[PDB]
Design a protein around this ligand. Structure first.
Ligand SMILES: [Mg+2]
Ligand SMILES: [Mg+2]
Ligand SMILES: [Mg+2]
Ligand SMILES: [Mg+2]
Ligand SMILES: [Mg+2]
Ligand SMILES: [Mg+2]
Ligand SMILES: [Mg+2]
Ligand SMILES: [Mg+2]
Ligand SMILES: [Mg+2]
Ligand SMILES: [Mg+2]
Ligand SMILES: [Mg+2]
Ligand SMILES: [Mg+2]
Ligand SMILES: [Mg+2]
Ligand SMILES: [Zn+2]
Lengths: 105, 96, 57, 141, 75, 62, 187, 55
RNA sequence: UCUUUCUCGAUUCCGUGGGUGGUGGUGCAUGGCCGUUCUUAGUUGGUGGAGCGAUUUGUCUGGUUAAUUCCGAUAACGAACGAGACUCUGGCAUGCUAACUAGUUACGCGACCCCGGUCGGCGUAACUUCUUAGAGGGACAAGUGGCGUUCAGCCACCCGAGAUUGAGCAAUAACAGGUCUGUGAUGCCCUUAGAUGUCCGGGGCUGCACGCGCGCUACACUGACUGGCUCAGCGUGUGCCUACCCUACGCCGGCAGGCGCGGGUAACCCGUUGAACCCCAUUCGUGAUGGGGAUCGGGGAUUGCAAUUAUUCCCCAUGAACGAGGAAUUCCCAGUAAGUGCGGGUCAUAAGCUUGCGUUGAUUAAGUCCCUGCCCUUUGUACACACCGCCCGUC
RNA sequence: UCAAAGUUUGAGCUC
């Protein structure tokens, strides 16, 4: 699965929850927006949500809480969203933050 | 300013038939835009109109690149005196 | 529609720039009806900013 | 079975170049030796039978998305004309080499000019794609 | 200030030295052999690809930028 | 920092001082009170008014 | 239509028309008490409202200047004959249209009424009308070579933001005095 | 005659060829969509034209 | 201009009155326009009080607040601007209003692979979940602890999809830094036929022993050389005059560029906005190296009326220093700094200007005012065109 | 529990 350099990033939550939860599912993931890594770190969180929603939605909720809590006890970024987005270059300078270069001499 | 006598009389007639006139201030014009049926290059209309102004016949205003001239009653009466027309007929702005 | 101008008269003040947007909005309505009734609805209820273009077929 | 998405693409191009040579019925151009891959490129392609490698890639892009004309294959196949001291820009591939790769695959029945324009992959082409997919799949397996 | 004047081809005695010693290093990269015996990294890559052909070294991770091979697992 | 302006504060003292009984501690309910009785054009103004009006009601109830 | 012009191009042509008209009537009713324009671009007909407070006085002799203005608009812009028609509407808040009241005052200043008392008088007249405030900056060089500034300010006044766009009426004006040229910044 | 002299220099392209219909200047002509105006008149007339400071 | 002679028919040329023209000089005569101070938290009337007066108090020791934000102390009270507020954007709305120029969920077929799977190959209707955008609605310190008049609220933690989304505008007052070099923007002074006008062609701005500032490229292998693979966001498209449209589909040249039919004036055609990076195997090999691409010979194209100061693009070649930055100095706290490409204005060649667009993605600090600046209080002053100050003696 | 820190066109500030 290219890019193959970012695969273990993809399995971290899969390894965290284990194959027993995901075993009953097969999931294709459609991706759009952002760039390649941004989208990769996106589909990471996406499938873990879809599975928690699967047990919370179509079967009993104790499965949703146990999965979700194991997730909370491992790592909070899985739940707290990255709001981070790329800042635009601004007029009045050569770079992003700088306002134009003051030039002695 | 070299007019053809034909233009002197037809241009005075133009001033009569529409009491008022507008024109772009643009020396570098082959043809006049609003009045493109005749060639009458904008420089011709411009220089004649500034000559009329000089003798009191048009009211001046200038915007962007464009003069704006209001023809006065002295102008209406002078045009009909030159062309020897009756007092019955009028421009479209006078006619109602 | 996006435009970026300088405030300065000369060269010499600061070099300042605008970030001018201009949005242009399109709605469109399709009816299945004779022509005269639609002419009746269309004549009434329009205001200056709006521009209506009705294709007949 | 398997497809291009299933394959690791590097050994894909080497297997397909061998596969197309085995067929030996592409009608390779006369100038394959002389030509350089883009006016913006410096050396000729590393693969010796490179014209076959781009015939593979162009066909496989037409599988990925059909209707890919010459200009279309050059946009997808565009990149940095690293201008050294001047700033970088987008640079199309070479026409003669791209147009002849597409005309080569149009010749040997891999690609087909569909009605209402653009290429679609022909019955023989989709056959060859999944067979060489199985061959390369067996290699990586 | 410093310069690397590396040899393009192995002598026969050096060939015996390779056949003896190189499979003993735990790190076998073309660059490793290049720094120790003052030889080029590219022919070094071809040499380690040759210990592969003759069947002397196991690959850990080769990659366009950087390759790594070793003597096969020791135990 | 979420600090109350003088237009925020004076409004909260006027709200608690005139209708201490209607008001209460919880924001979202006494919000319904504030939007009904007082016509606040902006929702941000409404909600801020209500949140300082609430905490102040707790001050007086204390 | 057969000419089949683009959306993007048509709308910019509209913008240039608008800008030229605003400039043109500012130039026209200086003497007549110009108070803005309103180009209600309706179907077929394009209503073109002169704005003035005393519209019958600014109108003059029997509707003369208005028939020539309607004809002028048609002449330069190329309207169908009688497709565009001008209407000199009464100004809302008749004091505050600055360029009407401020320019008339500019020409009052040019006529020789003192600048302080005249601006005070207009601000007072328009205050009796019920204005919120002003901050009138009249730059130049007066009673001397130095660049002295007059500044007529009163009432509650705000400056920044968007709200100002439809809160503040603004003007920039040159005036050709006997002594020189005077700047006008009307906020 | 004068008719073959008066305006004989070729004006086919560039901001020198076309010019602002306001300024007659060759500085910043907005040529997109045929606006054809200099950065100064544009800054002057943007509100009338409909441009707006959204961001 | 000369010998020379023909048209229209008083329009005009030439004088004189008088205007008028002038990219004349002067933005240090002017209007107007910028930056920085200043992205900080500050500023100003009224009435009353204190002072012969200039002025002060209001505008505070303290708490508090991101905030001259608030509270409370209290000879003051009520106000104003600015901050905030506002407008727009992001986000919560499977809710209202809704759509063959948007699709949708139910199935079936067809070619093949081992019933199904795939397909921008085809058919079955409603609807708006997705899509598009109007109206409404939506989160607030909502929970707690210390601390505090148990006030304002802080800090920390909990609680949560949001507990600062991000802009635009931006106070009073400067500099005697700049703009008459955008215009019939323009004051004053001067000029106008034996002209300082103007028109035609051409030039300098690109003229080069020398130097600087903004910029561009580097010193390589965490990388370059050579193939293949992959998600975008900014965008545009045939014009009043106005010469150049976006472009689908098959052929020709390495490149500039050449021949058939189409869609589109545009959610219909461009266009699934066919980006790079990423990802894989080679090749390079630590080299002034394929690092670096300045300079230029000879030639082929296009852009243009016209380029010598190479129009641009193209083809082959010579190939400076530079082996990671000394005293110096630019840039940065979160998707930021930094890598990397992509687009636009202008736009004939088409981004070398300039201004955006995506894409990958840290360190450090939660602190302080030492440096550098800044803000307040007190203080001294012989300065007040204000330390870029004033000011002293010999010769 | 104190080594030092100088100057600034003649070419026009101002009720
Ligand atoms: Mg690509
Ligand atoms: Mg001055
Ligand atoms: Mg305000
Ligand atoms: Mg001066
Ligand atoms: Mg604010
Ligand atoms: Mg001027
Ligand atoms: Mg010439
Ligand atoms: Mg290395
Ligand atoms: Mg080189
Ligand atoms: Mg060379
Ligand atoms: Mg003393
Ligand atoms: Mg000392
Ligand atoms: Mg001096
Ligand atoms: Zn301008």
């Amino acid at each position: 699965i290219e890019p193959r350099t970012l695969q273990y990033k993809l399995l971290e939550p899969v390894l965290l929850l284990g194959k027993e939860r995901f075993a009953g599912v097969d999931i294709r993931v459609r991706v759009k927006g952002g760039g390649h890594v941004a989208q990769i770190y996106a589909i990471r969180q996406s499938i873990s949500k879809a599975l928690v929603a699967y047990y919370q939605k179509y079967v009993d909720e104790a499965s949703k809480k146990e999965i979700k809590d194991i997730l909370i006890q491992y790592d909070r970024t899985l739940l707290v969203a990255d709001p981070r987005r790329c800042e635009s270059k601004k007029f009045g300078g050569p770079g992003a933050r700088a306002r134009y270069q003051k030039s002695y001499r | 300013m070299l007019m053809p006598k034909k233009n002197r009389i037809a241009i005075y007639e133009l001033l009569f038939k529409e009491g008022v006139m507008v024109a772009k201030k643009d020396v570098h014009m082959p043809k006049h835009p609003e009045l493109a049926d005749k060639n009458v290059p904008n420089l011709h209309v411009m220089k004649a109109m500034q000559s009329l102004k000089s003798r009191g016949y048009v009211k001046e205003q200038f915007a962007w690149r464009h003069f704006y001239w209001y023809l006065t009653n002295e102008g209406i009466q002078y045009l009909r005196d030159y062309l020897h027309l009756p007092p019955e007929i009028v421009p479209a702005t006078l006619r109602r | 529609l996006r435009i970026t101008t300088r405030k300065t008269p000369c060269g010499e003040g600061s070099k300042t720039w605008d970030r001018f947007q201009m949005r242009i909005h399109k709605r469109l309505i399709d009816l299945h009806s004779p022509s005269e009734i639609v002419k009746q609805i269309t004549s009434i209820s329009i205001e200056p900013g709006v521009e209506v273009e009705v294709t007949i077929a | 079975g398997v497809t291009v998405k299933d394959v690791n693409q590097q050994e894909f191009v080497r297997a397909l170049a061998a596969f197309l040579k085995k067929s030996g019925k592409l009608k390779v151009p006369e100038w394959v030796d002389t030509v350089k891959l883009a006016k913006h490129k410096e050396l000729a392609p590393y693969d010796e039978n490179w014209f076959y490698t781009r015939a593979a890639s162009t066909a496989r892009h037409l599988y990925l998305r059909g209707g890919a004309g010459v200009g279309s294959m050059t946009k997808i196949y565009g990149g940095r004309q690293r201008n050294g001291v001047m700033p970088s820009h987008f640079s199309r591939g070479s026409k003669s080499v791209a147009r002849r790769v597409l005309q080569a695959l149009e010749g040997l029945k891999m690609v087909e000019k569909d009605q209402d324009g653009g290429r679609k992959l022909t019955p023989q082409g989709q056959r060859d794609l999944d067979r060489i997919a199985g061959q390369v799949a067996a290699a990586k397996k | 200030r410093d310069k690397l004047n590396n040899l393009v081809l192995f002598d026969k005695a050096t060939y015996d030295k390779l056949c003896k010693e190189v499979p003993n290093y735990k790190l076998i990269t073309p660059a490793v052999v290049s720094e120790r015996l003052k030889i080029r990294g590219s022919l070094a890559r071809a040499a380690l690809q040759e210990l592969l052909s003759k069947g002397l070294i196991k690959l850990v991770s080769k990659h366009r930028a950087q390759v790594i091979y070793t003597r096969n697992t020791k135990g | 920092g979420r600090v109350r302006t003088k237009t925020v504060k004076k409004a909260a003292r006027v709200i608690i001082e005139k209708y201490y009984t209607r008001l209460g501690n919880d924001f979202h309910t006494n919000k319904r009170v504030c939007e009904e009785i007082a016509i606040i054009p902006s929702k941000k103004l409404r909600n801020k008014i209500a949140g300082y009006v609430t905490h102040l009601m707790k001050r007086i109830q204390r | 239509m057969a000419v089949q012009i683009s959306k993007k191009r048509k709308f910019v042509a509209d913008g240039i028309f608008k800008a030229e008209l605003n400039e043109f009537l500012t130039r026209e009713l200086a003497e007549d008490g110009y108070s803005g324009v309103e180009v209600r671009v309706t179907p077929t007909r394009t209503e073109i409202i002169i704005l003035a407070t005393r519209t019958q006085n600014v109108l003059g002799e029997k509707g003369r200047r208005i028939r020539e203005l309607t004809a002028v608009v048609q002449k330069r812009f190329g309207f169908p004959e009688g497709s565009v028609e001008l209407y000199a509407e009464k100004v809302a808040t008749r004091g505050l249209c600055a360029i009407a009241q401020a320019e008339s005052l500019r020409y009052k200043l040019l006529g020789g009424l003192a600048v302080r008392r005249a601006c005070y008088g207009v601000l007072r007249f328009i205050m009796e009308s019920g204005a919120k405030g002003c901050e009138v900056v009249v730059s130049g060089k007066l009673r001397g070579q130095r660049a002295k500034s007059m500044k007529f300010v009163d009432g509650l006044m705000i400056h920044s933001g968007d709200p100002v766009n439809y809160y503040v009426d603004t003007a920039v004006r040159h005036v050709l005095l006997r002594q020189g040229v005077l700047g006008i910044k009307v906020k | 005659g004068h008719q073959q002299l008066y305006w004989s220099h070729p004006r086919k392209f560039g901001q020198g060829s076309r010019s602002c219909r306001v300024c007659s200047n060759r500085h910043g002509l907005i040529r997109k969509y045929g606006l054809n105006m200099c950065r100064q008149c544009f800054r002057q007339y943007a509100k009338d034209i409909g441009f707006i400071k959204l961001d």
